[PDB]
């Protein structure tokens, strides 16, 4: 399904490039909880929540666009492997308090953002 492949690639490429820019320009600012990595995960939550809710209201929207936004954009923008390494590293550095804070702020942060994205569109309809 080459039409779908193009959606994952174009969307993912946009997502990954965004992650890259935000991560390189901002992660040094606070290395116990890199702001760039946090922000991409937060933002991809916001985006995906609003998109999911939006697609429930637009049930004729081509799966191409839905694929581009979720599996591509958000999936390329957000990152688990980067998050895990950051945390792993803080474990390696014995910095347990920020290792813990980092998983709380990433998981709880992203749930709040996905919910806010989904519900600010649900309250809007």
């Amino acid at each position: 399904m080459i039409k779908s492949l193009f959606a994952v690639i174009i969307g993912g490429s946009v997502g990954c490039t965004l992650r890259w820019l935000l991560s390189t320009k901002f992660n040094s600012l606070f290395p116990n909880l890199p702001p760039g990595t946090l922000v991409v995960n937060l933002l991809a939550g916001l985006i995906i929540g609003t998109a999911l809710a939006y697609f429930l209201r637009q049930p004729h929207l081509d799966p191409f666009w839905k694929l581009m936004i979720t599996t591509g954009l958000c999936g390329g923008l957000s990152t688990f492997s980067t998050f895990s390494v950051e945390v792993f590293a803080l474990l390696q550095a014995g910095n347990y308090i920020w290792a813990l804070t980092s998983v709380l702020v990433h998981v709880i942060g992203s749930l709040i953002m996905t919910a806010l994205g989904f519900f600010i569109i649900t309250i809007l309809f």
Partner: protein
């Protein structure tokens, strides 16, 4: 604004034969420090060990009395800006036992 080099490396206690060094950790997340030492001439090989990134001191043992040593510390750290670990640039000192 990014600190990956230790600062203020110094011998804080010493025998003729052993050394207690401390440095100030950099900002970044250090997984381990690398400690290197050897006689400042070049006359004997160079010794090297690591210390966990949680520690900002180390001891050095079995040195020869009255010899100038060169001591070097660098961080192996996670460069959050690039997504891999990096061996940081070192800070170095001379010390005569």
């Amino acid at each position: 604004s990014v600190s990956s080099v230790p600062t203020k490396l110094e011998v804080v206690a010493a025998t003729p034969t052993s050394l207690l060094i401390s440095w100030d950790a950099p900002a970044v997340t250090v997984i381990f420090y690398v400690i290197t030492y050897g006689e400042t001439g070049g006359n004997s090989p160079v010794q090297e060990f690591t210390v966990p990134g949680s520690k900002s001191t180390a001891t050095i043992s079995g040195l020869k009395p009255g010899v100038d040593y060169t001591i070097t510390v660098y961080a192996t750290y996670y460069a959050s800006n690039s997504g891999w670990y990096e061996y940081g640039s070192p800070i170095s000192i001379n010390y005569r036992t």
